[PDB]
Amino acid sequence: SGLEHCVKIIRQLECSGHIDKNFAQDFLTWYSLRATSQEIRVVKDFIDTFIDDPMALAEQLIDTFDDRVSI
Known part of the structure; x- marks a missing residue:
């Protein structure tokens, strides 16, 4: 599922220190509880687009979602 895939990549980014x-x-809390279906689709698109570059993915996830994620 979308969540399983998202957890796998997020754990990887954390383990790599990105x-x-x-x-x-x-x-993960945000993604699983608060993210709209449209936002979930955006996350999936980011993950697919940055598949070869975890550092770029991390930077983009932070830049785009940090405000929504952190509270």
């Missing part, structure tokens, strides 16, 4: 623990946890 995102921190707090962002990883906030992001």
Whole structure:
């Protein structure tokens, strides 16, 4: 599922150190509970587009979603 895939990549980014623990946890909480269906589609598109570049993915996820994710 979309969530399983999202968790796998987010854990990878955290383990690689491209995102921190707090962002990883906030992001997954947000993605699974608060993200609209349209936002979920955007996350999936980001993940697909940046598949070859985890650092770029991380930076884009932070830039785009940090405000919505962190509270």
